[PDB]
Design a binder for this molecule. Structure first.
Ligand SMILES: *[C@@H]1O[C@H](CO)[C@@H](O[C@@H]2O[C@H](CO)[C@@H](O)[C@H](O)[C@H]2NC(C)=O)[C@H](O)[C@H]1NC(C)=O
Ligand SMILES: *[C@@H]1O[C@H](CO)[C@@H](O[C@H]2O[C@H](CO)[C@@H](O)[C@H](O)[C@H]2NC(C)=O)[C@H](O)[C@H]1NC(C)=O
Ligand SMILES: *[C@@H]1O[C@H](CO)[C@@H](O)[C@H](O)[C@H]1NC(C)=O
Lengths: 393, 401
């Protein structure tokens, strides 16, 4: 028979938050919580892969003293043309015995290049992402790591404390319905469907899977008449759409996405998107709590602030004097929301003093500090910092 | 058990009945057998066994001497520019230039064979090219690759060259023959390789940021990538025919010659012996040497063999494309000064460095610029925060106090 503590923290990674657990008839408990990572992994469905194409051109069939015939071959971008009145030459003279009536059959088709296994872009259909969170909790003087789906259903138990993370206040994702993945880079792209690729553009060659034998090709391959007395297969074709996309893609989602999203691959995911808030439910077990009577009683409390600087970090120092009934551990917490204390728990003993670190934005900070079950008023004159800009949240 | 086909029989691919020295015994028959198994999954097991020669009249075993170059040969093919803009039948003709490697390495295919001698033996200091009717030996040192300026050759094996080239609009591959005569082939090729990372640098660093990149591996081994091969077409040779008083005399010289005359009687035929064509003139005849004992790359610059149909073989090639790691330098951290919701950076780049920035809120407003020299940048830091990426360095994050 434990106690359920419910709180809400902003969805911001690298910011430690202090939460006061107050179970009636039990000594207050301070828990430090920090989001280590927030992962948004969408479900992917591979439509096709694209890469550099290869124009397969065999040796042309030069039929000496005869007419060659083109046949319809079921190959991607298959092109065939028979050229009449040819008289090709090799180093030792004319290849054909006849002066006239010689034909050259030029043939070509498109297939995946040898590079397609190494250099390729994948077209995915991205739908309904599952939100996951890694949370660091300073629990019983030790740091515990909780990894749970931020759906408000996935219960994760660490050291008998049951954690329920979420649901996320924002269902926002930096990924659109259709995405393109190239190595470690992800792009939001309304890519052409399979069998709709255009010449010289992304998808000029389309392969459903990287192992696929048959491919779609639309490269505008047109065979030309060979040069006088020359054996070769001249042609006109739109350059590689994949090579063109590689230089025209622009900046990836890692650089363009709002809310400071970090984009990773294998699997494709959005990491640390600073959007909305995250509710946290902690079912703290019975054994973790200490009764008020079993906890030290504090009296004759006084607070002095010898040094303070109002900044994003703990620029304030406070010395709190006390009279404790017995030796033991006391939770330290700020009763004013404008001031936050670095220390969550300190050891007390009789007529002694404690030193705490605090953070505030106020020039004149008047705050109350609750050490165990007794409150003390702190008066602080905080000074401005050296820099207007900082490199931490 | 992997099975291969020979006429009306099936046999284990690794064990053809012609063993040992299949090619040495019957070169035409071996190539025909290999062509018949081109679509079979055990083709490479058959290619390995058929092109390996460990004869009986030998003390030791040479069972690992598989040499594909015993079946293949260097050749002459069309080149649009052999020097001074004039086309020729080049012994260094350009077939295909591959530039899929993001590291900038070019995989070049030529009509000659590097690292192989005329006797098929492997020698890195040598090169074999087609000299008129017969292949000849040349020095590897004389081989050169150039675009707008000379290239750095990183690897050579058979028809393939690996080269690191400066920016250009053409690609030239050449060599110097036995007679000290230079031969070159120029093709129009736009070479301007894209930047690996976010910094345009000249020399390769020992240490830096590890970024994914592709290259053509310097390994001489041929296991993944492949090319199509087939028997060469008939080689025209006017020297085979001579005027015997007032008639035509075809001298074969121990070769198989296909001849055709614009005269009566036995005007055509595939002869192995000398033939005479009476009441005929030398200009009325056409003579060519047949090549059924050798293989040649399926070149679109060389005609197909008229006798055989769609008969073809396949051989593995060196230097396949593979995913590797490219080390990139990290630009020195700029001198940073602060102001109210503002960040000021004094950028000192040693080479072109990409500067990018975005707001960490709802409206990121992504902006980018390539910084060439000394430039002071004034950036607004919103309440949501600002993320700045300077070259290959990890992104800097800024927030107001
Ligand atoms: C493949 O064809 C060959 C030749 O036509 C067959 O072998 C010959 O068969 C005849 C009739 O039985 C014998 O008299 C000859 O001595 C055989 N010659 C040789 C060299 O074997 C052969 O049977 C066929 N192969 C299969 C597997 O059916
Ligand atoms: C629990 O984790 C926090 C965060 O990692 C630890 O806090 C500090 O650890 C180091 C102490 O010198 C510093 O290098 C960190 O900057 C600092 N971080 C913060 C946010 O204060 C803390 O020591 C851990 N506690 C235990 C008991 O392991
Ligand atoms: C190449 O990529 C594969 C994944 O497809 C990986 O297993 C391998 O380790 C990579 N090799 C290098 C050298 O990066």
């Amino acid at each position: 028979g434990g106690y359920e503590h419910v709180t809400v923290i902003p969805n911001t990674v690298g910011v430690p938050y202090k939460t006061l657990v107050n179970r009636p008839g039990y000594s207050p408990m301070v828990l430090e919580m920090e989001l280590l990572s927030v992962t948004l992994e969408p479900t992917l469905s591979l439509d096709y892969i694209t890469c550099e194409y290869k124009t397969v051109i065999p040796s042309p069939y030069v039929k000496c003293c005869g007419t060659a015939e083109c046949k319809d071959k079921n190959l991607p971008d298959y092109s065939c043309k028979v050229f009449t009145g040819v008289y090709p030459f090799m180093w030792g003279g004319a290849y054909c015995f006849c002066d006239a009536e010689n034909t050259q059959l030029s043939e070509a088709h498109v297939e995946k290049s040898e590079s397609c296994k190494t250099e390729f872009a994948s077209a995915y259909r991205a739908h309904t992402a599952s939100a996951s969170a890694k949370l660091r909790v300073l629990y019983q003087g030790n740091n515990i790591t909780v990894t749970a789906y931020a759906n408000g259903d996935h219960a994760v138990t660490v050291k008998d404390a049951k954690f329920i993370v979420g649901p996320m206040s924002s269902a926002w994702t930096p990924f659109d319905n259709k995405i393109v993945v190239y190595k470690g880079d992800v792009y939001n792209m309304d890519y052409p469907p399979f069998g709709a690729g255009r010449p010289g553009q992304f998808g000029d060659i389309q392969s459903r899977t990287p192992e696929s034998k048959d491919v779609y090709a639309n490269t505008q391959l047109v065979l030309q008449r060979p040069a006088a007395g020359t054996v070769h297969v001249p042609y006109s074709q739109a350059p590689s759409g994949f090579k063109y996309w590689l230089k025209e893609r622009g900046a990836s989602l890692q650089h363009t996405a709002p809310f400071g999203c970090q984009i990773a691959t294998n699997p494709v995911r959005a990491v640390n998107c600073a959007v909305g808030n995250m509710p946290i439910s902690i079912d703290i077990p019975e054994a973790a709590f200490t009764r008020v009577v079993d906890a030290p009683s504090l009296t004759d409390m006084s607070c002095e602030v010898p040094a303070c600087t109002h900044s994003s970090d703990f620029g304030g120092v406070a010395i709190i004097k006390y009279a404790a009934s017995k030796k033991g551990k006391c939770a330290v917490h700020s009763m004013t929301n404008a001031v936050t204390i670095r220390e969550a728990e300190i050891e007390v003993e009789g007529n002694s003093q404690l030193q705490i670190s605090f953070s505030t934005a106020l020039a004149s900070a008047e705050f109350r500090v609750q050490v165990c079950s007794t409150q003390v008023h702190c008066a602080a004159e905080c000074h401005p910092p050296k820099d207007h800009i900082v490199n931490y949240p | 058990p992997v099975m291969c086909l020979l006429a009306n029989t099936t046999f284990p691919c690794s064990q053809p009945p012609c063993t040992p020295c299949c090619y040495e015994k019957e070169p035409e028959e071996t190539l025909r057998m290999l062509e018949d198994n081109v679509m079979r999954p055990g083709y490479y097991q058959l290619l390995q066994a058929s092109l390996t020669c460990s004869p009986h009249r030998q003390r030791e075993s040479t069972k690992d001497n598989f040499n594909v170059y015993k079946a293949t040969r260097p050749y002459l093919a069309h080149c649009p520019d052999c020097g001074e803009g004039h086309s020729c039948h080049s012994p260094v003709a350009l077939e295909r230039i591959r530039n899929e490697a993001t590291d900038g390495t070019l995989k070049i295919q030529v009509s000659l064979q590097i690292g192989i001698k005329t006797d098929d033996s492997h020698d890195w200091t040598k090169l074999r090219y087609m000299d008129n009717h017969m292949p000849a030996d040349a020095e590897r040192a004389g081989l050169f690759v150039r675009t707008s300026a000379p290239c750095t050759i990183t690897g050579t094996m058979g028809h393939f060259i690996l080269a690191r080239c400066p920016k250009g609009e053409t690609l030239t591959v050449g060599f110097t023959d036995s007679r000290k005569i230079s031969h070159s082939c120029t093709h129009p090729f736009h070479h301007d390789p894209p930047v690996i990372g976010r910094e345009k640098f000249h020399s390769r660093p020992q240490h830096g940021k590890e970024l994914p990149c592709s290259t053509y591996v310097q390994s001489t081994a041929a296991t993944t990538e492949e090319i199509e091969v087939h028997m060469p077409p008939d080689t025209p040779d006017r020297t085979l025919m001579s005027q015997q008083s007032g008639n035509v005399k075809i001298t074969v010289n121990g070769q198989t010659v296909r001849y055709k005359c614009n005269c009566g009687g036995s005007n055509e035929g595939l002869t192995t012996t000398d033939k005479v064509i009476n009441n005929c003139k030398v200009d009325q005849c056409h003579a060519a040497v047949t090549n059924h004992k050798k293989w040649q790359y399926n070149s679109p610059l060389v005609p197909r063999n008229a006798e055989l149909g769609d008969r073809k073989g396949k051989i593995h090639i060196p230097f396949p494309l593979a995913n590797v790691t490219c080390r990139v330098p990290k630009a020195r951290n700029p001198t940073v000064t602060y102001g109210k919701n503002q960040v000021i950076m004094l950028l000192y780049p040693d080479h072109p460095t990409l500067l990018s920035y975005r707001n960490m809120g709802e409206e990121p407003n992504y902006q980018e610029e390539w910084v060439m020299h000394k430039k002071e940048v004034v950036l607004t830091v919103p309440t949501e925060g600002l993320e700045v990426t300077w070259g290959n360095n990890e992104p800097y994050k800024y927030w107001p106090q």
